[PDB]
Amino acid sequence: AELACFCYPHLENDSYKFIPFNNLAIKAMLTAKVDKKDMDKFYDSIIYGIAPPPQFKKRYNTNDNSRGMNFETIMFTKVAMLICEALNSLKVTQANVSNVLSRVVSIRHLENLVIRKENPQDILFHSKDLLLKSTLIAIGQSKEIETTITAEGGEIVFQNAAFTMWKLTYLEHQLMPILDQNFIEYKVTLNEDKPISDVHVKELVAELRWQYNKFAVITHGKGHYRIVKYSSVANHADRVYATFKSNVKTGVNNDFNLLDQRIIWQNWYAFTSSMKQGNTLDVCKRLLFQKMKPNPFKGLSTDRKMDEVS
Amino acid sequence: AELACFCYPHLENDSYKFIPFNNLAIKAMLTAKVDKKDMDKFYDSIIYGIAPPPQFKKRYNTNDNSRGMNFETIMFTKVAMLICEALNSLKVTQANVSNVLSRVVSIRHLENLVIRKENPQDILFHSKDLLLKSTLIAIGQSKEIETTITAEGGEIVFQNAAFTMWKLTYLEHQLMPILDQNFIEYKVTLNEDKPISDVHVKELVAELRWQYNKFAVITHGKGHYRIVKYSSVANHADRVYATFKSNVKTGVNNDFNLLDQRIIWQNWYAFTSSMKQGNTLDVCKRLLFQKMKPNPFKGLSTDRKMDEVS
Amino acid sequence: AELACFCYPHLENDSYKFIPFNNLAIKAMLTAKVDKKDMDKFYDSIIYGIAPPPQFKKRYNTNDNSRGMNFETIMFTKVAMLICEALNSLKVTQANVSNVLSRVVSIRHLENLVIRKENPQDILFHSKDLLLKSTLIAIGQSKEIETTITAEGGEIVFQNAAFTMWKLTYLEHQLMPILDQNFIEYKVTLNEDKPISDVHVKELVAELRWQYNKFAVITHGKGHYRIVKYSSVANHADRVYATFKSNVKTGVNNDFNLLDQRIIWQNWYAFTSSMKQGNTLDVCKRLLFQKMKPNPFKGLSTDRKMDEVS
Amino acid sequence: AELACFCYPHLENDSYKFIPFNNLAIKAMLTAKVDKKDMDKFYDSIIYGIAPPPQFKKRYNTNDNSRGMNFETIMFTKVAMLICEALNSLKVTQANVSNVLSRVVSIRHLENLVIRKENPQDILFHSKDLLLKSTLIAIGQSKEIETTITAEGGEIVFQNAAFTMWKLTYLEHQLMPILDQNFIEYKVTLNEDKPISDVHVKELVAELRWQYNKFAVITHGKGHYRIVKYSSVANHADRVYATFKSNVKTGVNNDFNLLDQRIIWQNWYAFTSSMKQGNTLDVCKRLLFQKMKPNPFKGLSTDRKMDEVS
Amino acid sequence: AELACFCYPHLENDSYKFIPFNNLAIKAMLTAKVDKKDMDKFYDSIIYGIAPPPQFKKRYNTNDNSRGMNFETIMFTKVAMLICEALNSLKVTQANVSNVLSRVVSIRHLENLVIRKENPQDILFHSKDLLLKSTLIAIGQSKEIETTITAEGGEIVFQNAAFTMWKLTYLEHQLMPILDQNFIEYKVTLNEDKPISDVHVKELVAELRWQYNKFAVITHGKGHYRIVKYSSVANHADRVYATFKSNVKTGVNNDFNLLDQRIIWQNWYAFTSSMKQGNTLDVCKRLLFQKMKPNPFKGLSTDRKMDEVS
Amino acid sequence: AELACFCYPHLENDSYKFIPFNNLAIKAMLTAKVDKKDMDKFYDSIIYGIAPPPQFKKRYNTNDNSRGMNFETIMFTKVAMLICEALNSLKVTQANVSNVLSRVVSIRHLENLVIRKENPQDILFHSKDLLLKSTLIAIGQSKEIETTITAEGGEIVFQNAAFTMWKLTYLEHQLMPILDQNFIEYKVTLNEDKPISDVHVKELVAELRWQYNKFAVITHGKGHYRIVKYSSVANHADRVYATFKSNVKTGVNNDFNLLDQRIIWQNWYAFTSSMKQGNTLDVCKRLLFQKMKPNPFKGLSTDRKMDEVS
Ligand SMILES: [Mg+2]
Ligand SMILES: [Mg+2]
Ligand SMILES: [Mg+2]
Ligand SMILES: [Mg+2]
Ligand SMILES: [Mg+2]
Ligand SMILES: [Mg+2]
């Protein structure tokens, strides 16, 4: 959903502060009759303050809508505050306000950060500057790359010198949980942005082949690996391509990190290298469905299997 | 119930302060044997302080009484405090104390205000002067008209530039809930006290005809619409008339706002216009039961129906 | 789903008997690896007997599939028995078996009949020939028209000399309940197949205008009215048309009862009269979205409203 | 545990009938003081009948013993009856009684058969001769090979023309459940005892490599595959060897079916082929821990992965 | 309580049959106003049949009485039936009826027999003649001695060739449970009425010294041992003496089995041998409180302790 | 477990402070792939701080490990803090840090101290110096002897001028409870370290013989008695000997307090006196299993028994 779904802008001393919505103001908005002239304007409830633009009604779950968010949970307020805390660390100028609030962000990413920020064991609980960097990356108002320390979080299921792998907890989420219960996705983040030695890559690939054999290793180009079910690689190719296409139409720069060719699924490296060369979706997606002949380390499966036998 | 059911007056520096009753003092009063000479005087429990006059015993629920209030709930204290907070914002002089405490008020209205005052999303939680205006209107110690910002509250089910419509939550109430579970009533308050354009009236009437077709649109003359079941319009006519009659006997001024003739139920506008002309109950009530031939906007039902089909 | 999802055919003395599936046989089928040569053939589990053809896997709910049926409930067995009881009342010859088992039927209709058959108050519990007629209509192996006595059932919400109106209980269903909780549909069945006097039609239309004002009165042409939300008339038009189209391609006769023009929604009568004239979907569906100028009984709303006021 | 833990022998007309123990007779036995002269003799409680020999005390769970069985469950009686039903289908002669009752059997195998026998969907519920064959195989009083139709049961997780694979449910068991909750074991039984075509083997191996990559495919030589965690192959090698060794000392014939070399784990085929050649445990077990260079079908993993991508 | 608390006599063909009371007839009796002339006569409720004599009111628990029985439990009916079943196995003649019904019996003993009779594992469930012998002993209408096979029952906590020891379950009882939760009593019954070898006595005494060191071994003279807390031996001496005294006044024969002098508590053997010589209570009870110098088997404690160390 | 399982060292101003681990840092460590070069080094999670050395993985309960501790309970943090509070009361120098953190301690002892420290009735709650002395004794960084005031705690079941006896509550523990539910152990601590008069010893031995007859009175040499089941004396002899042996190899001084010969179990005094003379395990352990002929106070059992009879 867009940032304008959680906060509205307020000017103070020619510097913009952002304010979370009340959920009762959202609920009043969803019952409002509004002119089409006013659907892009912020709504005013008399009782509960300002509400998002009525054009965003579909972002909110209703008796009719299940494809939105659960805006009446406490989590909605925590995520709105988190966004607002980060938008206020910038001082957005009037020229920029409409653009920042238009940015579409992952609610599940933001919720996971709240879970990190409120956990006293997590470094984000103790470093207001780390949390701010983490949130700024999430809401796309920073060009730093998400790494382990700035990751959205989840359950750590594997760690080594170079990588931390997280299980994404989206089924348990309060604000916008994934509905199909057959969902499983993992994330591999970089600990540092340095080059990685071959042994630390071998360790990762061994774990993925042994424990995540039914998962593809892909990426959306923003610097980290995503461990997704093979039955969903086709949908991921669609969304990655739409984003690559939409950014070519808008002029936004498309720098896509293909990551290590030894870790990424071979077919996915093909589909995304082709995409990075400029080919259309159909040229690109057909490479997902080919069976390619060749790979990087051999016998990794056997080593781990023989370790278990002991 | 009368204001004297929640507070008693105490003098300090020739200015009256009001003090909420303890519910255990009420419970002691309900067991007291009192002279008829003393039934209009405030009762003294030895253990729990002052108690309402014993003539008010019927206002309180007992093993025998179900037509009173649940004075032992925490809500009774909150409502008593709310009343007392407003009575203390005035400085009632000795000549006036008996009259203010004699005023009969809607407990359900007062309870709903408590629900607004204790809700951090509600403007009443943040504006002590709005809350005071709201309470003063409720306890009839102000001649301002209830509007959306000063409304008793409830669930917002419709809003536009001119109107907010509230569902009255009286079944869930703690202090004096409505007992029949077949109850449904709605309230339409004015957002501002200005004149209203024809489009904003058309929007309201369309919603009422489409979503509240089984409800009459009536008013008690105090500036807002009440959406009530047709099976209860007869009882409402009684109470509105009794009030109009009792105020003619007492000399209290009867200014009755008939509201927009395009919104009010046609028959009800008739019964109340006749009442405002001075006719008796029987002349007036018989106009409720006539079927009148004609109305203000045609095809509003069809427009909304055709919108839904898309 | 097709009849072959609940029973398989077995020959005895050149007369076909049908046998319900075990749900564990279905569960074994859903784990089976089967040649494409064999996907239209009945599956053999070793432990639990015969199972439906693997081409029907999608009809059954899985960890992956939610758009099928809950075949592991007791209700699945009751519905399979009901089908089988009716298929055995016929003696289907070898030429016919594949055609009967190919027939697609409403599981919710069949489940509702089970609820009637097992209820000792219901005439279906007492008349094995009524139940058989009811089931034969449901599984499309009879050309009699569904009437009140043979209806699928539900909660009776209105009855008069000519009509019974049923609320469809599909949200509570065990085998294939409707998932959106915003669902409400009603059914109006004929008590007898005779002509209906004008007063009995006036009674029905009055109830629908007063109590079901937010519902369209439509029909699928098989002899009874369906009371559906206006927001769903578009989807109903699609399915009715597909059926009318698919039967023109297959040569199946399309007799469509347009029912009383005074009861059916005006726009729907148009879309279906146009369909019955042979026009394409787009010519027909556009008549759903027009606003037409004129209707049959006037003042019915007012009469019922005035009755309530008393 | 030994068969003498569930039944005792009783002679009628020079033919032996077997009788299940009462669990209260077992409980009396566990409190009994018995001469060492009598520890191999059946115990007599006065109140509850005959009880197992006191030398079997350790087979029964106590406040002190957790490595025995839950003899006070209803399941103990069902398993005792099942054993007794099968022992009575034979007519064991006096020379044989001590030998049959000495036979050690898998309680979990017997419990699983009870779960099949009491399930109306299961063929064992309907065929008293199949159930008897199944039980006779289980209690080692038959030289037929366990196949799908005679299998102990469990959840079917894969089936094809040649094989059925079962998940062993031992954690849910009442009489002697597996305690570590980290347990998972699967069983692959033959549907028929015929030769198996190469495609049906390819189908099995593809499923095992894709869905059971973290499992070894081994066998105990009695005609079916066992899918066990690699971390437990070492323990299985011990038990298989002890049995092979103990049968060489006792003269019992050791026919060990090595099954298909394309399905069995390569190392396990080695350890068991060596065992079948007569080598000692240490020569044999060391072959489990080698990493061997080569295998039967290549690209099976890739085919299944590419199927999922579609 | 007396037998007349559970049944009343009814004559048929000059042979007496006994009939259980309805608990509602008892409840009517406890509200009845009755002449003192009629307190020893059976009461007639009009609605529920015959009720016990009103002189027995104190035997029944009331809002006022806790020292009686819970006559409204199902257990009361089962115990009444058990008594009645045994009274009907005799054919009590008119001369005898008043005497049998006057007999005072242990309700807890009778309840325990019901628990044995309704247990399919218990021989009493299968032998109507054993159950009858057991009940006849209990209600003192038989001079046979209670043994293991005829015991009242409970949990078996020790058994050997000569003895069975039972834990008395009186805290869990439905009809008349022991109220202090600090209660523990055990019973040692003879398996046969033969002489007992010295090893089987050594086994019993070893178990009592090791596991029941805080318990006295006493007897009430009726052929079995009672394992009671030392803090209650004084009360037991009272009741045993009262019975021995009351039977000397009534002429009932007093045969008191002193049991094995090696098993009985030394002091208790003294108090009861003195009682059997004719001394008064004070001569006898003072022997309970002496500390006597010497005993039968030495080192039994040490043997059992050393067994445990291994 | 070793002290390094709860805290890691941090240097400040050439004085060492110790810091508790986060349990999420431990959980990240248990998923980490670590070089063998690094298994003795403290682990760094990026998100949750420092974690114990990976060589300690087995000290922590996992889905696979039940023989470790429940490090995710709040109790783990309280025990880590308690350790850290005591390690910081010392100022451990760099030479010493590795040695202190290597010390193996009783987690159950530490948990019991937490239960004392957080109890406002306990003197440890009020005396930070008593608590520190108590913890320093527990973690073996003090040579004072545990006494009643510094005891680990538990339920007091007996007290006199010289001794307090505690029931060890290890089954209820959160961090590392004893799993067998058949566990019972008691502790007898000295109130003062003075000589004890003969009457106060007689009082203790009387209580142990009467109420703990099935328990051996032993000691591990550190100044207090342990009341353990005879069935476990053999295991205790093993552990006491291993400690005595391991300290002879390491040069740590072995001062073993044999305590009062009148209180200790005779056989145990023998096994430990022999151990203190230098004999091997087999010479020593065989003295546990002998039956020795003679003891200190006679008739103590009889006195207590006779007290109870009154
Ligand atoms: Mg990415
Ligand atoms: Mg009004
Ligand atoms: Mg139809
Ligand atoms: Mg095998
Ligand atoms: Mg006796
Ligand atoms: Mg010690």
mmCIF file of N, CA and C in Angstrom, chain D residues 22-25 27-29 31-35 43-49, chain E residues 116 119 121-123 148-149 154-160 164 166 191 200 203:
data_model
loop_
_atom_site.group_PDB
_atom_site.id
_atom_site.type_symbol
_atom_site.label_atom_id
_atom_site.label_comp_id
_atom_site.label_asym_id
_atom_site.label_seq_id
_atom_site.Cartn_x
_atom_site.Cartn_y
_atom_site.Cartn_z
ATOM 1 N N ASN D 22 -6.319 -59.361 31.449
ATOM 2 C CA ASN D 22 -6.889 -58.149 32.023
ATOM 3 C C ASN D 22 -5.763 -57.232 32.476
ATOM 4 N N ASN D 23 -5.947 -55.923 32.277
ATOM 5 C CA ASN D 23 -4.887 -54.993 32.656
ATOM 6 C C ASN D 23 -4.763 -54.878 34.168
ATOM 7 N N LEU D 24 -5.867 -55.083 34.894
ATOM 8 C CA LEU D 24 -5.793 -55.130 36.349
ATOM 9 C C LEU D 24 -5.046 -56.367 36.842
ATOM 10 N N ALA D 25 -5.095 -57.471 36.092
ATOM 11 C CA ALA D 25 -4.267 -58.622 36.435
ATOM 12 C C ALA D 25 -2.787 -58.306 36.241
ATOM 13 N N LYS D 27 -1.562 -55.271 36.533
ATOM 14 C CA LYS D 27 -1.235 -54.340 37.607
ATOM 15 C C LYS D 27 -1.024 -55.068 38.928
ATOM 16 N N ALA D 28 -1.780 -56.142 39.171
ATOM 17 C CA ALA D 28 -1.554 -56.945 40.367
ATOM 18 C C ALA D 28 -0.214 -57.664 40.293
ATOM 19 N N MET D 29 0.142 -58.156 39.102
ATOM 20 C CA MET D 29 1.426 -58.825 38.912
ATOM 21 C C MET D 29 2.591 -57.894 39.227
ATOM 22 N N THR D 31 2.835 -55.652 41.342
ATOM 23 C CA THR D 31 2.994 -55.486 42.781
ATOM 24 C C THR D 31 3.317 -56.790 43.495
ATOM 25 N N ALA D 32 3.423 -57.895 42.766
ATOM 26 C CA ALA D 32 3.545 -59.202 43.391
ATOM 27 C C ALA D 32 4.981 -59.479 43.811
ATOM 28 N N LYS D 33 5.132 -60.169 44.939
ATOM 29 C CA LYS D 33 6.395 -60.784 45.321
ATOM 30 C C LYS D 33 6.370 -62.237 44.867
ATOM 31 N N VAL D 34 7.330 -62.610 44.026
ATOM 32 C CA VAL D 34 7.326 -63.902 43.355
ATOM 33 C C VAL D 34 8.696 -64.543 43.527
ATOM 34 N N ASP D 35 8.706 -65.851 43.769
ATOM 35 C CA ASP D 35 9.954 -66.599 43.796
ATOM 36 C C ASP D 35 10.616 -66.572 42.424
ATOM 37 N N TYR D 43 1.308 -65.691 36.089
ATOM 38 C CA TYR D 43 0.942 -65.288 37.432
ATOM 39 C C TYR D 43 -0.566 -65.346 37.594
ATOM 40 N N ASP D 44 -0.994 -65.691 38.798
ATOM 41 C CA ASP D 44 -2.408 -65.751 39.126
ATOM 42 C C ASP D 44 -2.768 -64.657 40.114
ATOM 43 N N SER D 45 -3.574 -63.712 39.663
ATOM 44 C CA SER D 45 -4.173 -62.767 40.578
ATOM 45 C C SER D 45 -5.458 -63.440 41.025
ATOM 46 N N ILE D 46 -5.899 -63.133 42.236
ATOM 47 C CA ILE D 46 -7.096 -63.828 42.680
ATOM 48 C C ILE D 46 -8.325 -63.169 42.071
ATOM 49 N N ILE D 47 -8.235 -61.877 41.769
ATOM 50 C CA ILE D 47 -9.405 -61.053 41.510
ATOM 51 C C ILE D 47 -9.633 -60.876 40.012
ATOM 52 N N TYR D 48 -8.550 -60.860 39.231
ATOM 53 C CA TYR D 48 -8.625 -60.445 37.834
ATOM 54 C C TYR D 48 -8.131 -61.500 36.851
ATOM 55 N N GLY D 49 -7.917 -62.732 37.290
ATOM 56 C CA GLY D 49 -7.483 -63.774 36.382
ATOM 57 C C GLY D 49 -5.976 -63.867 36.250
ATOM 58 N N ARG E 116 -16.477 -53.491 42.491
ATOM 59 C CA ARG E 116 -15.983 -54.774 41.999
ATOM 60 C C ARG E 116 -16.999 -55.447 41.086
ATOM 61 N N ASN E 119 -17.164 -54.198 37.473
ATOM 62 C CA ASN E 119 -15.910 -54.188 36.734
ATOM 63 C C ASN E 119 -15.758 -55.507 35.995
ATOM 64 N N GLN E 121 -13.355 -56.965 34.600
ATOM 65 C CA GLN E 121 -12.140 -57.706 34.922
ATOM 66 C C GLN E 121 -12.258 -58.468 36.235
ATOM 67 N N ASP E 122 -13.155 -58.047 37.124
ATOM 68 C CA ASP E 122 -13.256 -58.631 38.454
ATOM 69 C C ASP E 122 -14.093 -59.904 38.406
ATOM 70 N N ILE E 123 -13.593 -60.957 39.059
ATOM 71 C CA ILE E 123 -14.318 -62.223 39.162
ATOM 72 C C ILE E 123 -15.735 -62.043 39.698
ATOM 73 N N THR E 148 -9.363 -62.767 50.112
ATOM 74 C CA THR E 148 -9.031 -61.963 48.940
ATOM 75 C C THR E 148 -10.140 -62.026 47.899
ATOM 76 N N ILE E 149 -10.632 -63.231 47.606
ATOM 77 C CA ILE E 149 -11.641 -63.384 46.563
ATOM 78 C C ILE E 149 -12.953 -62.714 46.958
ATOM 79 N N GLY E 154 -10.568 -52.405 46.286
ATOM 80 C CA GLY E 154 -9.607 -51.326 46.347
ATOM 81 C C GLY E 154 -8.463 -51.573 45.389
ATOM 82 N N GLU E 155 -7.417 -50.768 45.537
ATOM 83 C CA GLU E 155 -6.231 -50.900 44.702
ATOM 84 C C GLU E 155 -5.285 -51.921 45.318
ATOM 85 N N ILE E 156 -4.890 -52.914 44.524
ATOM 86 C CA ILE E 156 -3.903 -53.881 44.986
ATOM 87 C C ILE E 156 -2.535 -53.213 44.978
ATOM 88 N N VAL E 157 -1.886 -53.178 46.138
ATOM 89 C CA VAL E 157 -0.559 -52.586 46.269
ATOM 90 C C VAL E 157 0.508 -53.606 46.623
ATOM 91 N N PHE E 158 0.129 -54.843 46.935
ATOM 92 C CA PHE E 158 1.079 -55.904 47.234
ATOM 93 C C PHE E 158 0.340 -57.231 47.182
ATOM 94 N N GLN E 159 1.001 -58.249 46.641
ATOM 95 C CA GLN E 159 0.426 -59.583 46.604
ATOM 96 C C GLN E 159 1.536 -60.615 46.708
ATOM 97 N N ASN E 160 1.242 -61.708 47.402
ATOM 98 C CA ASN E 160 2.105 -62.880 47.415
ATOM 99 C C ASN E 160 1.217 -64.112 47.555
ATOM 100 N N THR E 164 -3.000 -60.647 49.908
ATOM 101 C CA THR E 164 -3.204 -59.506 49.024
ATOM 102 C C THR E 164 -3.437 -58.289 49.903
ATOM 103 N N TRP E 166 -4.681 -54.329 50.029
ATOM 104 C CA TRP E 166 -5.505 -53.374 49.298
ATOM 105 C C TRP E 166 -5.408 -51.991 49.918
ATOM 106 N N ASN E 191 -5.445 -64.989 51.168
ATOM 107 C CA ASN E 191 -5.825 -65.578 49.889
ATOM 108 C C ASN E 191 -6.597 -66.870 50.116
ATOM 109 N N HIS E 200 6.298 -66.721 53.471
ATOM 110 C CA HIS E 200 5.233 -65.834 53.012
ATOM 111 C C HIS E 200 4.870 -64.792 54.065
ATOM 112 N N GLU E 203 7.713 -62.208 53.867
ATOM 113 C CA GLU E 203 7.531 -61.314 52.729
ATOM 114 C C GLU E 203 6.575 -60.178 53.069
#
